[PDB]
Structures are given as C-alpha cells and as structure tokens.
Amino acid sequence: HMFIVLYVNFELRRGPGRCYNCRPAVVNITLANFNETKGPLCVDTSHFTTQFVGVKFDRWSASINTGNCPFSFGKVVKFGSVCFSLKDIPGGCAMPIMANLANLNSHNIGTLYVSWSDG
Amino acid sequence: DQSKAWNRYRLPNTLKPDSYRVTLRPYLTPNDRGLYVFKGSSTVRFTCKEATDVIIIHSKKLNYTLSQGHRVVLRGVGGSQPPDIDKTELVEPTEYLVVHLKGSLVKDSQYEMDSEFEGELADDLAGFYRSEYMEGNVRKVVATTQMQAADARKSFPCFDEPAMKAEFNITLIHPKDLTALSNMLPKGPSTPLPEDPNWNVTEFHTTPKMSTYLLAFIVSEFDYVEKQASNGVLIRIWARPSAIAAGHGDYALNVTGPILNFFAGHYDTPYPLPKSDQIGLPDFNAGAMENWGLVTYRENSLLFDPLSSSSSNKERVVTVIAHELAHQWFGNLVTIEWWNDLWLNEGFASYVEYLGADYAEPTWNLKDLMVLNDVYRVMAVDALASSHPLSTPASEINTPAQISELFDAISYSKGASVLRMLSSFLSEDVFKQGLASYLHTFAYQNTIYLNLWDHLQEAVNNRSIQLPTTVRDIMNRWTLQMGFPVITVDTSTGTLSQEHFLLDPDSNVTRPSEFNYVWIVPITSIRDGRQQQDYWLIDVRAQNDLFSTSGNEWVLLNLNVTGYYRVNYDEENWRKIQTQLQRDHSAIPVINRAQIINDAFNLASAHKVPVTLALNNTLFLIEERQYMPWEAALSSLSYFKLMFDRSEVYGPMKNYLKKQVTPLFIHFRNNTNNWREIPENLMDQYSEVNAISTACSNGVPECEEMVSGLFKQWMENPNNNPIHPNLRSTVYCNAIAQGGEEEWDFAWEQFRNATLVNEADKLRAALACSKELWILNRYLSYTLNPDLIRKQDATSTIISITNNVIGQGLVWDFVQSNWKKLFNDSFSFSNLIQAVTRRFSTEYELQQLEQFKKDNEETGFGSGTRALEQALEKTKANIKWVKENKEVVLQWFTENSK
Ligand SMILES: *[C@@H]1O[C@H](CO)[C@@H](O[C@@H]2O[C@H](CO)[C@@H](O)[C@H](O)[C@H]2NC(C)=O)[C@H](O)[C@H]1NC(C)=O
Ligand SMILES: *[C@@H]1O[C@H](CO)[C@@H](O[C@@H]2O[C@H](CO)[C@@H](O)[C@H](O)[C@H]2NC(C)=O)[C@H](O)[C@H]1NC(C)=O
Ligand SMILES: *[C@@H]1O[C@H](CO)[C@@H](O)[C@H](O)[C@H]1NC(C)=O
Ligand SMILES: *[C@@H]1O[C@H](CO)[C@@H](O)[C@H](O)[C@H]1NC(C)=O
Ligand SMILES: *[C@@H]1O[C@H](CO)[C@@H](O)[C@H](O)[C@H]1NC(C)=O
Ligand SMILES: *[C@@H]1O[C@H](CO)[C@@H](O)[C@H](O)[C@H]1NC(C)=O
Ligand SMILES: *[C@@H]1O[C@H](CO)[C@@H](O)[C@H](O)[C@H]1NC(C)=O
Ligand SMILES: *[C@@H]1O[C@H](CO)[C@@H](O)[C@H](O)[C@H]1NC(C)=O
Ligand SMILES: *[C@@H]1O[C@H](CO)[C@@H](O)[C@H](O)[C@H]1NC(C)=O
Ligand SMILES: [Zn+2]
C-alpha cells in the first residue's frame, strides 16, 4: 500500500498595504516523493490512497479541481497503473490547483497532471 | 478695515498660482504637550497678473518657522528678481498669510515662495487631521485629510479658491511600516528617510490642473482589495485590515469600476487618471468626499457585510459611490467658478448618482426614489420665504460660514430635481449629449451656470428639439429665483394658474426676483390613467382643453413627478381621484399616489385645500401594499406627530394609524413566515420595515410582542443575532423603549464592542428611544465624550435624543444653556437647530427661540444662520396651523379611527 499526497500551501504578502484578494505572494505546492528530473510518480501498489493537504485560513482555501480529467483527485476505481506529476505528462489529464478567496477571486497556482493505463 | 485687501474675504486678482510642491510629515504619537502634530514645507510658483506690493495667500492654524527674519522666503524665476520682504503677518478672520513687500512685483513675471510650517493633527475632521480605531488592544492613529470647502489652507499655505487651479507635487514622510496615499500614484518606491531610517519618503506624480479642495493625503496601516476596471483604471478599496479581510469592502469593489466606466461611456468623456482609490475612514464628517483619485468615505457609506448590513445600507453604499464617482466629471474635471454655483457640482452628482446606481443594481429601480428622497425633501424648505435660489449671486457668498451653509438641500436635492426635469422635457440622450460637449470644452477649467445652458442649447439645435424658448430663459426661472410654483387646475374650464407656493400664506417674501416668481413649466398629464400630450405653461394663467374634463373623467398633472412643482385641483376632480383610489388605486401610477398624498398635505398647510381632504387621501392606504405611497403618507404625517405628540390629539391619531396599518402588518406577517424571510423585491422590503415600524409605533400589540420577543431572544444568545438586518433599526428602538435598564445596557455594550459601523449606527439610534428621562440625560452626556461616541456622531446622536418626545425638553434646555460653550467646538449647528425646533408650535416656544437668537446674536450662528431664520418662520406658521386645525384634526382621527 502507498499514499499519494499533494501538499498545497500559500501565504499572502505581509502588510502594510497588502492586497487581500491578489494572487498569493508565496506558493508552495509539493507532491510527496516526487522528483521533477526523474518524472511522473507512478503507482507501485496493489491499492493506493490519495490525500489532499490544502491550506485553509479565514476565507482563503486551497483546492484541486477536476479539470479535463474523467475522474477527480480523491474519488479514484480500477487501474492498470496510474502516474502523478507536477509537470506535463503528454497524453494525460490536468487537475488545476486553485487558491480561492470565498465569494471573490480564484487564482490558479499550479497544476497536477495524471496519467493511467486501462486494467 | 475693508479698505485693506487682507481684511476682505475674496482673494485679490493680482496673483495666480501655477504649480505647488508640498512635503508633509504626520507625527502619529503625541508630543510632551499632548498634541498630535504635522510638520511641512511648501513652494508655490505663481504669476503676477497685476503689479502689487503684497502677497496674500490663505493660511489657517499653521505656525511658521522663521527664515531670515520672516515666515517665508521669496525667490525669482527665470531671471525675475523679487523685492525684499518688509514683514509678514497672519490675519485670522480672513485666514490669510500676508507678505508686505518693499517693492512691487512685475506684471507677467513668475515668483516662488518657500514656507516652513507646523500644525495640529486634531480630531476635528478638517484639514490634515487624525482618525483612530482599535486593532486588538492597540489604538491605531491615521493621518487623513478633508479640504472642502476651505480647509486646504489648514494643511499648507495656498491660494485656496476653486478657480485658482494648479498642479501639485506631493511628498509624504511617514513611519516605515505605514503606507502613504495621495491623488496620484507614487513616483517610484518609498525610500528611507536618510536622516532617520525609521521613516520613509513617498513622492507622488504631479497632479493635473486641480482645485486645492480636492487634494488628499493619507498615512495608514490599511489593507485593500483591487480590481482593474474595464476602462483600464485600477480600483482599490482601502480600509482597516480586519474589515478588508472580512470582505466588507468586496461590494464596493464589485460596483465601483463598472459605475466609473458607465459614466465615462454615458458622457463620452474618459476618466483621465490611472487609478481611483476608495478609502473608508473611522472618523469623517460628511458621507464621503470626491478627492480626485483618492475618494474618502465614512465607513457606513463604503463598507458592507452581507450577513449583518441591511438592504438600505447596501443602497447607501452604491448610491454614495455613484455620487462620488459622478463628481469626477462634475466637480473635479469641470469645477465651479465660486461656491455660489455649488449646484453645478452637487446638483449633478445628486442626480447622476441615480443613473450610476441604477446601472449597477438595475433590479432595484432606484430612480423612482428620487421623488421622495430629493424632490419632496427639498420642497419642504424651498416653500419658505427664507429659502434661497439654486444660483445665489456671487457677491453674497464670501465667508467660510456662508460657503458651508450652501451644502444644503437646495444645492443637492433641488439641483437634482431641476436636472430630473431638465433631462425630462429634453431626452436623457439629448441631455447627455449637451453635457458631453460641456465637459470637453471646460475640462480642467471652471464654469458658471450660463456656460451649461449654452452647450445644452447646442444639443437642442443639433437634435432639432423644439422648445418654447431658449434653454437659458427656461432654466433661469428655476435657477436664479428661489422656490417653485403650485399649478392649480380647473377641470371645468381647462384653465391653469401658477403662483409662488409658500407653506404659510402670511410669510413675507423679501428676496426680489427678476421674473416676479413666474416660471416656464413643462407639464405632463394623464387622463383616466392615459398620458396626454405635453404642454408648456409660459404665463401666469392659460387655458387648454388638455385639462378640461367631462363626466367621470379625471386628470392628473406631473406624471411620475418629473417636474419641480405642486398641483392643486378643483373640488370635483379631487373627489373623482379619491373615488378612484377607493375603487381601484392601481389605475393611478404608484409615484402619483405619493404625489396625491404629499401635495394635499402641503396644500392643506398653505390653506389651499381643507386638511380633511389631505387626510381623506390616506383612507385607501389600508389596502395599499407599495412602499412609496405609504412612505409619502408617513412623512407628511410626521409633521402631525411633531405638532401633536405632546397633546390629547396623539391618542386618536395613533388609533387611526393602528387601524390603517394593521392589515398590512398582518399581510407581511404571513408573507414572511412570521418574519423568517424578507421580500425579494427591494421596495417591498422597505414597505415591510415601514409596516413594522408604523404598527409598533402606534400600538399594535402583536408587533410590540414580536420586537420585544426577538430582542430578549437575542440577549439570551448574544453571538447569534436572530433579527434580520432590515428589521434591526425598528426592533432595537422599540425593544429599548418597551424595556428598561437591562435592555439599554445590553445595547450599549453591543455598541461599544461593535466591529461593523452599520450595526453601531442602528444601536446608537435605538439607545435614544429610552422612555427613562434619567437614561436620556446620561446618554446626552455621552454624546460629547469622544471616548464613548465619536465626534463624527455627536450631533447625529443628540438629534436622535431630541426626536424622542421625552428628549425634546432635555435637548432644547441643553442647547439654550450651552450654546456659547458649544459653539467653539465637526459639529453641525445647522442640523441641530432644525431638529430641536421643528416641534415648536406655541407662542412660549417662539419666545424662547427669539430670546435664544438675541442671547447669542453677536457671537453668531455661523453655518446655522439660515436654519435659525427658517426655524422662526416655521414656528410662527406652526402656531397658526395648530390653532386652525387642532379641533378639525382631533375630530377627523376620532371618527375615522373606529
Ligand atoms: C512640480 O513638478 C513638475 C514636474 O516635475 C515640475 O515641472 C517641470 O518644471 C521645470 C521647471 O523647473 C520644467 O523645466 C519642466 O519642463 C517641467 N516639466 C513638466 C512635465 O511640466 C514643476 O516645476 C514642479 N513644481 C514645483 C512648484 O516644484
Ligand atoms: C412612470 O413610472 C413608472 C415606474 O414607477 C414606469 O413604469 C415602468 O415602465 C417600464 C417600461 O414601460 C416597465 O418595464 C416597468 O415594469 C414599469 N414599472 C412599474 C412599477 O409599473 C412608467 O413607465 C413611467 N411612465 C412614463 C410615462 O414614463
Ligand atoms: C513546502 O511544503 C512541504 C509540505 O508541507 C514542506 O515539507 C516544505 O518544508 C515546504 N517548503 C517551504 C519552503 O515552506
Ligand atoms: C532528483 O533527481 C536527479 C536526477 O536523478 C538528481 O540529480 C537529484 O539529486 C534528485 N534530487 C533529489 C532532491 O532527490
Ligand atoms: C501654534 O501656536 C499657537 C500659539 O503660539 C499654539 O497655541 C498652538 O498650540 C501651536 N500649535 C502647535 C501644533 O503646536
Ligand atoms: C520603507 O523603506 C524600506 C527600505 O527601503 C522598505 O523595505 C519598505 O518596504 C518601505 N516601506 C513602505 C511602507 O514603503
Ligand atoms: C461581488 O461579486 C462577486 C462576483 O459576482 C460575487 O461573487 C460576490 O458575492 C460579490 N460580493 C459582494 C459582497 O457583493
Ligand atoms: C453641434 O453641432 C456642431 C456642428 O456639427 C458641433 O460642432 C457641436 O459640437 C455640436 N454640439 C453638440 C452638443 O452636439
Ligand atoms: C372627507 O370624507 C368625507 C366622507 O367621510 C367627505 O364627505 C368629505 O367631502 C371629504 N373631505 C373633503 C372632500 O375635503
Ligand atoms: Zn457631492
């Protein structure tokens, strides 16, 4: 068994005169056990569990959208082999990562890419 | 005295400024004398238009550092050689700094004047002043500005008249942890002050040619939200960090940009600046101020909480923003020549505000509310002999008190109403075309009223509009003479008659009129609910079959009250109107049902119809559900309350109102599921509030039980308010009046710990509804303690107390006792006089008012002078009105109350 953990954190610019609804000045998106120069983190499991660890303070919150993906992070379901990355996987899906200000702006701050085979 | 120029209130024509540079440094901690102060310097470059041996410039409450023995240094420009200074002096009454020269300045040459000065960052809400608020356990101090009309001189020396436009180079020295803001964007990033790194220096780009009264300097720890408008302009909503984080500036951001570009497109005139900052201050005298690029607001005119603010608060926010943004064109780009024409600024803003607000919230239909909130609001004062024309002669406006006095219902609401009518006989598209030319031609300049007629005539001609005469001759009748006409219709003949309407026939009109109080009136009409052709009344008396009737026919004049006049009818037409209101009032437009009510009550006061006719017009209200007709009746009858709520007549009147409103109250009780929902339509929301307020105020037991129940439920769960914000003003006030010390204390603590000014305002007003005289006396002492009630809310709270029948004698005694002490020290002496005297209806009260005038005559009443004269005129009319109507009214209420 193995967990697939996507960490999403962001911070607003410090005052004075901070723009509360602007795109967060600091953004830290980490996919656990992923190295950009080795490529997609693919599944080595008989079963795996996805965990989303998004920041939430006051009206600000992080979320991962479904994007152009037949599934959603969390609700994944049979697999041949599924791969995850924070860089483009040609032939896969793109799950947008957003920083959302409740009832105001939403900001795209990253992208999770998923790939899979049938089985 | 008057022989010397420095003892006269208007600046000489000898010097004209070209460009200023100003550096200001607020000290947000008190000094060893206990004062918050600001230090500044300034250089003004000016041109000598006419040779003179004196420099007269405005200066108010500024202490100057002497340089080479004098308060200023004078230098030459491009070869010019300035004479030596003989001496400088400060002339306090005219607020001048006077530099007496040993030689004469040379015509057409330029000069530069350096000064170094200090002033107080007082809590007086004028000039460069301070505002405070709590963040945690820390009291934050803000440096901010308010220059209109004549307080720019209080922050630095300047030629402080709106027609002395100039460019300004602002520099602000501020603590390093604070942001500095001004009209323009900063000219580079904020640098540390070399002398002291704990301070930074922010220099701002040069402003456009501008009036001094539109400058703004702010130093604060505020945050903001931003959004770029669809016309390129950057919008930012600034406020306390907690308010921004909570989202209380989000609604302002949603509407500000769109309204700005709507105005730009509507008048075919771009907004020439790259940004427009909206900032809400904790301490602020007026509602807002249109400083070019840095619009300042009362928190309750800009901030909005969706869960705790009411729909009426929401309307206020979008309306004031629209008002301030309209000023960017009518006021900032094109400015009045002198304050006597103030309506060119405030009349247009008070009219255009409805177009901008309607664009932002098209479902509300706010433009209809202009008849209640502007037209009939100002007709109350414009029907006095002591009113004044929209455009006063410039010779008559000189002192700061005279100037402040004209920020009144004439310059605002009447100006709006004549524009509403002007924009009605011509189309809004013809109107806006004429204004587009007016704005383009006079950009960065100053105008008088005749300049506007010319460009409206250009539009009339290009669009082939046929008027009875020139725009000039039509609109001068509504601009150069005070008041308005009453159009009396005789439907048996079809004859029309106009005359100056005066609330008291015996009032003495002393102001002469070059038109002998005759107007050119555009008259619309409906016949049995069907609009007829327009007609122009150009003489005192006319005849036309458009106003003749046969059989069951009835006619009404002034459709949707677009024109600024009142209408009276022959008895028979009135009767058919009343029959129509009883059979099916929907046949009469909603606005004209309000007209029928309001006109008759005012006509009755003027002894032009029987008071019983006006009261009979309120009988159909028991079946009326719309907001406007009910509000017209409640407002007209507030005069009856003022005259009778201390007499035996109040009982019968309350029973009548109880009868009339109870079905409506029960209707809303059903329509809302016992008050757990609010109507979807905005006007229906306001009619619900008035139904609850009227029912509770006149003794409907169900409403009294409801409001005290809701309030007690709240005290048992303080952190979960069960009262919808729309009902809070009414529920709070009635629960306070019905309760006692426990309810008053609970609301007082809620007011002290308030995080939202909208909520504090409602609590502040409801605390004045206490029935305990000792509580009202204690509350009165709070209003003058700045640590308990902000100075910006002092007079407003005192007015809430005087509106309480138990508070009337307390406040009047207080005003008589403390006027001399009061007068020195932000405080609307005019509004308070208006409020504390409107109940006067006896010779005894008139005696006190007369003695009040004599006892304080020499000290003066400042911007309350007209208010007092109008109080005397109204008090004398009230005496006659009560003697003539008391028994009639008492009997009418008793009979129609069963
Ligand atoms: C305010 O700032 C403006 C812009 O920096 C100054 O205008 C310049 O004035 C100098 C004369 O010293 C001219 O040579 C430049 O051509 C001007 N530039 C522009 C763009 O007009 C202005 O002099 C400053 N005023 C004061 C009182 O300091
Ligand atoms: C008089 O004012 C009323 C509004 O109080 C106008 O009524 C609206 O007219 C528009 C377009 O005809 C309709 O879409 C609205 O539903 C109407 N509102 C109401 C409340 O009826 C009316 O048109 C005005 N009369 C004139 C001649 O302009
Ligand atoms: C980014 O987030 C990861 C996961 O929460 C954390 O381990 C890491 O320290 C963070 N990096 C920075 C620079 O904050
Ligand atoms: C990531 O992979 C590259 C290529 O193998 C390697 O050079 C680099 O050191 C790795 N970084 C980490 C943090 O493992
Ligand atoms: C300016 O001088 C006057 C008179 O000397 C004094 O009363 C006032 O307090 C001074 N203002 C400041 C800010 O020190
Ligand atoms: C003040 O200056 C310092 C140093 O240049 C800078 O780091 C800081 O951001 C400045 N503060 C403001 C409010 O501009
Ligand atoms: C402002 O508009 C946004 C976008 O339509 C809306 O989601 C939001 O609720 C509005 N905010 C307020 C306070 O009106
Ligand atoms: C009227 O027409 C003339 C000539 O076409 C034009 O110069 C002027 O700007 C027009 N005025 C208005 C208000 O449209
Ligand atoms: C008031 O109503 C009565 C009927 O109750 C009517 O006789 C009278 O004419 C009305 N007053 C008028 C029309 O002034
Ligand atoms: Zn205004």
Residue numbers in the entry:
A (entry chain C): 299 to 374, 378 to 420
B (entry chain A): 66 to 890, 895 to 967
What do the authors say?
The coronavirus S-protein is responsible for both host receptor binding and fusion of the viral and host cell membranes. Its ectodomain is composed of the N-terminal S1 region that harbors the receptor binding domain (RBD) and the C-terminal S2 region that mediates membrane fusion. To address these questions and to gain further insight into how the 229E S-protein mediates membrane fusion, we determined the X-ray crystal structures of three additional RBD (Classes III, IV and V) complexes with hAPN, as well as the cryo-EM structure of the ectodomain of the S-protein trimer. We find that an invariant set of core interactions defines the interaction with hAPN across all the RBD classes characterized.
To gain insight into how loop variation is accommodated while maintaining receptor binding, we have now determined the structures of the Class III-V RBDs in complex with hAPN. RBD Classes III, IV, and V are from viruses that arose while circulating in the human population and they share important features that differentiate them from the tissue culture-adapted Class I virus. In Loop 2, they all have a deletion of two amino acids that allows Arg 357 of Loop 2, the last of the absolutely conserved residues, to form a stronger salt bridge with Asp 315 of hAPN than what was observed in the Class I complex. In Loop 3, all three classes have acquired two leucine residues not found in the Class I sequence: Trp 404 and Ser 407 of Class I are replaced by Leu 402 and Leu 405 in Classes III, IV and V. The sidechains of these leucine residues occupy the volume filled by the tryptophan sidechain in the Class I complex. The sequence changes in Loops 2 and 3 lead to a small re-orientation of the main body of the RBD in the Class III, IV and V complexes. This in turn leads to a compensatory twist in Loop 1 which preserves the core Loop 1-hAPN interaction. As a result of the twist, Arg 316 emerges from a different side of Loop 1 where it forms a salt bridge with Asp 288 of hAPN in the Class III, IV and V complexes, which is not possible in the Class I complex. In Class V, the motif is GPG and by constraining the Loop 1 conformation, the proline residue (Pro 314) likely leads to a stabilization of the interactions with hAPN. In Classes IV and V, the conversion of Gln 311 to Arg 311 permits a weak salt bridge interaction with Glu 291 that is not possible in Classes I or III. The Class III, IV and V RBDs all bind hAPN with higher affinity than that of the tissue culture adapted Class I RBD (16-fold for Class V).
